[PDB]
């Protein structure tokens, strides 16, 4: 059987697919073990290392992620992978573990950008020019 | 087996530096023209200077004397379509200074805008002289 999941992180969207296999994970056609940089690789692989060998050596996961930066892509893929694993196992020990570790694995992140306002719109909403009187 | 300060045309360049960057101490030669001349001569610019054979120096000089004949495209040269002869040429320091001088002086001799700006010492091209350019 096959299962599909999704994940969102600011402006980025990931779709993951899990099925039976040997333990391979691919993100945009390439393995996760040669993902650079390390700060994104650990981000993506933290749920797998929490789930363990006896669960991950039996499945194969493929993620297609597009939009919004490499860090956002990595977070979205992490979310999708956690959700897919929890569903595929229908295990609750895993869910408790993930929740005590970081509840944004399964739950998402709702933060987006604030629109910009005049008096130096380019910089941001709250930043302004300086005066000297 | 490395000369620590070599003596190239007119100039006593430093041997402690690579050749491409040591040749840069000559007026009329940048890093890019230097790399060109060295790739034509057949020398490794990425090597510590000092082992600059007399014949290598002589060939560098042969090239600097007439670069176009030895390749060196006419668009990588310092003075294309010379006002008096055509004959795209590259000058190093001496008729370089003198050629700058002659250009400015011919501009002054006909009483042109640019010549008068050179005389008075003010910006020549188009700049706005109200807020900046304070002596």
């Amino acid at each position: 059987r096959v299962i599909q999941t999704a994940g969102k992180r600011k402006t980025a969207v990931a779709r993951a697919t899990i099925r039976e296999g040997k333990g391979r994970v691919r993100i945009n056609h390439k393995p996760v073990e040669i993902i650079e940089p390390e700060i994104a690789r650990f981000t993506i692989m933290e749920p797998l290392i929490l789930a363990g060998e006896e669960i991950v050596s039996r499945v194969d996961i493929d993620v297609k992620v597009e939009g919004g930066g490499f860090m956002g892509q990595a977070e979205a893929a992490r979310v999708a992978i956690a959700r897919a694993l929890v569903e595929w196992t229908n295990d609750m020990n895993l869910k408790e573990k993930f929740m005590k570790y970081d509840r944004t694995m399964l739950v998402g992140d709702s933060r987006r950008t604030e629109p910009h306002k005049p008096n130096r719109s380019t910089k941001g909403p709250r930043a302004k020019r300086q005066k000297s009187y | 087996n490395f000369r620590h300060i070599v003596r190239v045309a007119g100039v006593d360049i430093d041997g402690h530096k690579q050749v491409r960057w040591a040749l840069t101490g000559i007026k009329g030669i940048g890093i890019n023209f230097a790399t060109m001349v060295l790739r034509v001569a057949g020398i490794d610019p990425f090597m510590k200077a000092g082992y600059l054979t007399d014949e290598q120096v002589k060939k560098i000089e042969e090239i600097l004397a007439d670069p176009v004949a030895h390749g060196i495209p006419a668009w990588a040269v310092n003075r294309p379509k010379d006002y008096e002869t055509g004959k795209d040429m590259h000058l190093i320091t001496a008729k370089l200074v003198m050629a700058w001088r002659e250009d400015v002086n011919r501009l002054r001799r006909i009483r042109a805008y640019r010549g008068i700006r050179h005389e008075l010492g003010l910006p020549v091209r188009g700049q706005r002289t109200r807020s900046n350019f304070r002596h």
Binding site: - | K81, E84, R109, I110, Y113, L120
Partner: protein, 116 residues
């Protein structure tokens, strides 16, 4: 002796327009290819009449974007600066220049002392 890129005057005079333009810089080549205008051409007629006989008067003009050609050497041309007609006697080393480079608009600034 004067030599413009190898060639002398007597040669530049007999040379064509498309040959001469190959010696000039890009800007003047482009201008002279895109072509002259009614004003410039009436001035050229005036000059060709003056260099031989008919015209016996000074040559005045408002045309400052006009380019100095070899056929214009040996003449005097009065160019407008906005207020007055400045005389310019055209020397061989002017070739390739606009008439406005030899007729200035603003006066040299000699600063006084600041005020309040």
């Amino acid at each position: 002796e004067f030599r413009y890129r190898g060639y002398t005057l007597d040669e530049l005079l007999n040379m064509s327009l498309e040959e001469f333009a190959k010696l000039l810089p890009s800007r003047q080549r482009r201008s002279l290819k895109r072509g002259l205008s009614p004003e410039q051409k009436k001035l050229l007629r005036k000059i060709r009449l003056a260099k031989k006989g008919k015209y016996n008067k000074p040559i005045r003009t408002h045309s400052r974007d006009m380019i100095v050609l070899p056929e214009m050497v040996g003449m005097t041309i009065h160019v407008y600066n906005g207020k007055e007609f400045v005389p310019v006697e055209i020397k061989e080393e002017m070739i390739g220049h606009y008439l406005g480079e030899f007729a200035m608009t603003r006066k040299v600034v000699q600063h006084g002392s600041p005020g309040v």
